[PDB]
Amino acid sequence: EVQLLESGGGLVQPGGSLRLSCAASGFTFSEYAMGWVRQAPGKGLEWVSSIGSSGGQTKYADSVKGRFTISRDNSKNTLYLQMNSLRAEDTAVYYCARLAIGDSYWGQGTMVTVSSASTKGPSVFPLAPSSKSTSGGTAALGCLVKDYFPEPVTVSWNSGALTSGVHTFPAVLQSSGLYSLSSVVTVPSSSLGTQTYICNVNHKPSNTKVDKRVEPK
Amino acid sequence: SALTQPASVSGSPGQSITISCTGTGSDVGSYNLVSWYQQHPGKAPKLMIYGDSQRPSGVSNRFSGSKSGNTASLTISGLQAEDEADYYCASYAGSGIYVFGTGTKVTVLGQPKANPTVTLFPPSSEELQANKATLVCLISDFYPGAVTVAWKADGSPVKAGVETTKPSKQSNNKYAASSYLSLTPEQWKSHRSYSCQVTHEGSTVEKTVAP
Structure with missing residues (x-):
């Protein structure tokens, strides 16, 4: 089926530049017009730009005219958006979309963050279960992911093999302007003696990959 | 337009x-x-x-x-x-x-009223070795989506260092929230107990941790 995969989003200083890509497959790229749509955090969808099937008829939202350039390479089945002179108000998820009558395929989007603040990787601390093996019932253990910027981080457990009972909570935005979150997994108390628990923390904006073993106190 | x-x-x-x-x-x-x-x-x-x-x-x-x-x-x-x-x-x-x-x-x-599950963690040893301390109060599976959180140290309230998220829906259609209390290791070590109190629709759920 149809696939649209955006890439190139990231953190940039105001006035900076970024180029987004959208790799397409599962359809004849060259006979579809293509577009970009964006969405600021917690805000609504905003159309950005469109381009004709053969690279003509480029159009732009006024909010973006003179700063962004849409283009495509039908030989590489790729759509681009060059974004210059970026400002905080350009912070958004950017979606690639195939323009068609009767259907509407979208990518998952790529996150663009425009800020004067630098990226900060997280510090990771284990959250040990208070309940011991003998005490019965269930035990909650976790990882605290402290003081990072920007969003997001993902947290997995045992390299992705432990998924049941996993809850990664929404992050708090602290007054410092840095985020923190926690991920908890609830397991049988009797498993604490025999099973290893490692949280795998990923913060792509800082290229941070941390594995933290979480052990009874 | x-x-x-x-x-x-x-x-x-x-x-x-x-x-x-x-x-x-x-x-x-x-x-x-x-x-x-x-x-x-x-x-x-x-x-x-x-x-x-x-x-x-x-x-x-x-x-x-x-x-x-x-x-x-x-x-x-x-x-x-x-x-x-x-x-x-x-x-x-x-x-x-x-x-x-x-x-x-x-x-x-x-959807029906759901009382919150409250899980409270003390500062880890790793973090205290880093000359920091955070108490983590995690609140989940509640409806409707409003809670009030209070922290106490040996019974007396603490407001400084508290940072609490706004509730939002989980994949199970119930709300979750988090509250973090920042302290120095010395404050943490200088008390017998710290408590996270979560009030939801008149009822208070509380947890307690100690050094």
């Missing part, structure tokens, strides 16, 4: 609701190109209606679209909890231009 939608529409399970989308003669009153999208948190928009009234394949007939004048309308019948989401109309507007509506947040009421 974003098409105008009601910001918020609430309904009860099994009822019908209608979301209006009012534009100008240049887009809505200029084409039968009004589409409706459904957006769940953290996902791409999903096309539910195109060409005013057509459903793409796979879309339930509970969703229907109409249009008269400069105003398009999306009606959802047989309201289900999964319909809780954001909805956007959109129209072509000539010359390769598209305009999206301002969006409507649909809320589906009726």
